[PDB]
Swiss-Prot record, chain A:
Protein family according to the UniProt entry: Belongs to the nucleoporin Nup85 family.
Function statement: Component of the nuclear pore complex (NPC) that seems to be required for NPC assembly and maintenance. Involved in nephrogenesis.
Protein name: Nuclear pore complex protein Nup85
Subunit description: Component of the nuclear pore complex (NPC).
């Protein structure tokens, strides 16, 4: 509502964020629904980036580059995150839908 | 679940012997396929949940139908009964 | 009771609701059917009795010439007293038979019954193409109706098809 | 009268329908044959 | 010869319309044979083309969605 | 021919590929052949196999059993239609 060159951008961002998986319960704990929701979110983000509704703006481009899951960008913007546990949870949120205890220690290391 | 485990399902459908439990397992698999894997079922329900996933669904359904037709052509003979009885006749 | 009978049919339909292994259950079913028939007959007869007791002021009539069939049957109904119960039982049994039949038009359409049959059509086609009088003679004076007019015998298939058609007509 | 004109237009439309359906069926046959010989 | 055959058939029908020994055949014969044959051919061709193109379009859309879900 | 019209399978809106191909096509292998002699031989063999023994067998079966579900009694209708379509020829 404030910036005149961001209405459709924020609308597309809100439509993309609606595909976030908030732990679905279709009977029991199922990881297939979580994986499908994460894949759909990634596909929608890639489609928007390739079409251009999520490009041609420096702020939203940097936001998408951070959400994609990088390391140097987060190390530069470390003023937002806290410490190593914050870095680990950010990686686990922006890189994989869910992780197993067999790989959680590897990811934390 | 059948599509996720279509490897062992198709392997069991293709591997048949003259034992006792194998025929029952094949019959149960064919019944489950006929009850929860049909083109009419796909056209009726779940038609609005990723047609590509539905494409793989109907592909596996056609494969299961080919396997069922092969099993029917193999076990459709009257002499097959007495041919398989001698393989499991313990006494 | 009809709803409960339909539900019971849908229930016992998975274990053969007939054949030979159905003795005491069939007896109870026929007893319930006879009870329903008796209830319907009681209702109809007592409705007619109440109507007659209400219209008892109109009695003692006579036959009048130069009238219509409607007035004739009306004066007959007003004069005679057994015709009341007779027509009551007639209409009650007719309604029972109609309800038991249901919708026979769809059944006849699915059975596919007509006048001309495949054997007669093949005989006519053969007689029009060559000159082979197979089965019964089927002369045609510009229309396949000469044997039907002269009351000539036909083939066994046509005879059994006509028998089935007349059986359906009798059921109707 | 617009009745005879409409009838003539409908006849011409039916003729065009037939002439277009013939070539459309031929094109579908050719396309399906090409797809079967390519795949 | 089909023109002469149709002319002879029309003449025979017009002659036997007044005769009571051709009513069933006259009722079975089509009123407009050319128009009825044209309508039947058009309907058959349209149904065939529709079924074929619909099945092909369904298969193509299924393959499209499958490849899209496989690539993204 | 106009008799070979429509291709809907079932009460729902189902379609099929092609219908009649004058040339050699793989769809002809899925549907009927391109020759009337094959259909005529099939009908003749069916009429020869549908002898008095099979007719008596089907009659005894339909007399000893009359369905088990709800779908309207069509046994005699199916029998007579099959007999007619097997003893008739195709145009």
């Amino acid at each position: 509502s404030t910036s005149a060159s961001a209405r459709s951008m924020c609308r597309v961002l809100d439509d993309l964020l609606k595909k976030m998986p908030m732990l679905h319960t279709g009977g029991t704990q199922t990881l297939t629904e979580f994986e499908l929701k994460w894949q759909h979110w990634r596909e929608e983000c890639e489609r928007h980036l390739q079409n251009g509704t999520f490009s041609s703006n420096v702020h939203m481009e940097a936001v998408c580059r951070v959400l994609l899951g990088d390391e140097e960008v987060l190390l530069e913007k470390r003023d937002l995150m806290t410490t190593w546990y914050h870095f680990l949870v950010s990686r686990l949120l922006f890189k994989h839908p869910t992780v197993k205890p067999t790989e959680l220690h590897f990811y934390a290391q | 679940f059948l599509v996720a485990h279509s490897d062992t399902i198709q392997a069991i459908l293709r591997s048949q012997e003259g034992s006792l439990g194998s025929l029952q397992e094949l019959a149960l698999l064919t019944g489950i396929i006929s009850k929860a894997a049909l083109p009419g079922v796909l056209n009726e329900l779940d038609i609005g949940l990723n047609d590509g996933s539905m494409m793989e669904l109907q592909g596996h359904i056609g494969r299961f139908q080919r396997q069922c037709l092969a099993l029917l052509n193999r076990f459709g003979g009257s002499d097959r009964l007495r041919q398989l009885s001698l393989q499991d006749d313990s006494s | 009771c009809n709803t409960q009978i339909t539900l019971l049919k849908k229930i016992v339909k998975r274990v053969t609701p007939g054949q030979q292994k159905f003795s005491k259950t069939a007896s109870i079913l026929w007893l319930l059917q006879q009870e329903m028939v008796t209830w319907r007959l009681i209702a109809a007869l007592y409705r007619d009795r109440i109507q007659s007791a209400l219209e008892e002021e109109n009695m003692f009539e006579i036959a009048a010439p130069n009238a219509s069939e409607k007035t004739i049957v009306d004066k007959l109904f007003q004069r005679d007293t057994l015709v009341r119960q007779s027509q009551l039982v007639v209409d009650w049994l007719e309604s029972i038979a109609k309800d038991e039949v249901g919708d026979f038009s769809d059944n006849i359409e699915y059975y596919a019954k007509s006048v001309y049959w495949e054997n007669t059509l093949h005989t006519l086609k053969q007689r029009s193409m060559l000159s082979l009088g197979s089965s019964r003679p089927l002369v045609s004076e510009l229309d396949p109706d000469a044997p039907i007019r002269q009351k000539l015998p036909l083939d066994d298939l046509d005879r059994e098809d006509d028998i089935r058609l007349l059986k359906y007509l009798f059921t109707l | 009268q617009h009745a005879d004109e409409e009838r003539e237009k409908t006849y011409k439309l039916a003729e065009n329908i037939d002439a277009q359906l013939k070539r459309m069926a031929q094109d579908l046959k050719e396309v399906i044959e090409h797809l079967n010989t390519s795949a | 010869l089909e023109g002469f055959a149709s002319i002879e058939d029309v003449q025979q029908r017009n002659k036997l319309k007044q005769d009571p020994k051709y009513l069933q055949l006259l009722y079975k014969k089509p009123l407009d044979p050319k128009s009825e044959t044209q309508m039947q051919e058009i309907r058959r061709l349209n149904q065939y083309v529709k079924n074929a193109v619909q099945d092909v379009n369904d298969v193509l859309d299924l393959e499209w969605d499958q490849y899209l879900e496989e690539k993204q | 021919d106009p008799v070979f019209s429509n291709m809907t399978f079932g009460n729902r809106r189902f379609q099929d590929t092609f219908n009649t191909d004058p040339n050699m096509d793989p769809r002809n292998l899925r549907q009927n052949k391109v020759s009337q002699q094959d259909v005529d031989t099939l009908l003749r063999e069916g009429a020869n196999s549908f002898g008095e023994s099979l007719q008596k067998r089907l009659l005894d079966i339909e007399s000893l059993y009359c369905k088990v579900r709800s779908r309207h009694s069509f046994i005699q209708a199916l029998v007579r239609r099959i007999r007619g379509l097997l003893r008739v020829s195709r145009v």
